[PDB]
Amino acid sequence: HHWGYGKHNGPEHWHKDFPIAKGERQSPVDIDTHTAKYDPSLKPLSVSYDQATSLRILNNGHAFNVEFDDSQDKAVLKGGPLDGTYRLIQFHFHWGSLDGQGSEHTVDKKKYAAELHLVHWNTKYGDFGKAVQQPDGLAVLGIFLKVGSAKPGLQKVVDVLDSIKTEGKSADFTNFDPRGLLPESLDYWTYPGSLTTPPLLECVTWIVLKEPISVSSEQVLKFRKLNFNGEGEPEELMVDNWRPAQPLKNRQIKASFK
């Protein structure tokens, strides 16, 4: 793709090819914890990932995605602000060149080292491609990563990154259990937003968890060794693949907790 995260094709340029970049419900945003409204009508999230089937990990030149079999209700998200059942299709991360940046959402202007996005689509629309054209088509669970202790359940991912260093490489990636990426608490903020990469469609109910997970410096270091470029092209390290916070405009962030 022509878009990317550099000086000449990065997020401040995206609106020329994707005019929705300046839309009314763009993501990410800063979550102002004192202005977020506690909504006691929000239900607990229901995450059912015991039957998840991972298939493949791939470097798509802007992040790396772990892809799941979503041809049946095997790993689903329900409850919270959602209606209906949303199936997990892929997860990926955004991270920085240094530990003090990398998350897309911020919490009272605080940046975290990275942000994990678990992407799910509304099974009433039949496939992911139809779901992205609907205002309630996707639900993305966002989880912040801070640097501290290692996360053992992430190690299987960091160990295969060597095999998908450059854009377009993929590897088999089976029997990965995404339950090892979840914090203890499922308390969350939710708001209506968009994909944070092109095509930036406004089809996302965001569900951002309050509690970060900790990963080790050595674990996030290995993310920073991947490349944006394809094999044989000049080396450009895959770092700072985050979009800056966008205006909230006419939107309220709701919290599941006080």
Contact residues for Zn ion, defined by CB under 5 A = 117
Nearer to Zn ion, 5 or 41 (CB): 5
d(CA 255, CA 82): 14
The catalytically annotated residue of 8, 13, 62, 105 is 62
Which of 118, 175 has the CB closer to Zn ion? Answer: 118
Least distance from Zn ion to the Cβ atom of residue 243, Å: 9
Residue 28 vs 81, nearer CB to Zn ion: 28
Residue numbering of the annotated binding site for Zn(2+)? 92, 94, 117
Tally of CA atoms within 13 A in the half-sphere of 93 that contains its CB: 29
Smallest distance, Zn ion to C-beta of residue 150, A: 23
Binding-site residue ranges for substrate: 196-197
Residue 165 CB, nearest approach to Zn ion (Å): 20
The smaller minimum CB distance to Zn ion, of residues 87 and 117, is found at 117
CB 49 → Zn ion: shortest distance, Å? 18
Q: Give the DSSP per-residue string, 46-85.
A: EEE-TT--EEEEEE-SSSEEEEE--SSSSSEEEETT--S-
Active site residue 34: no
Active site residues: 62
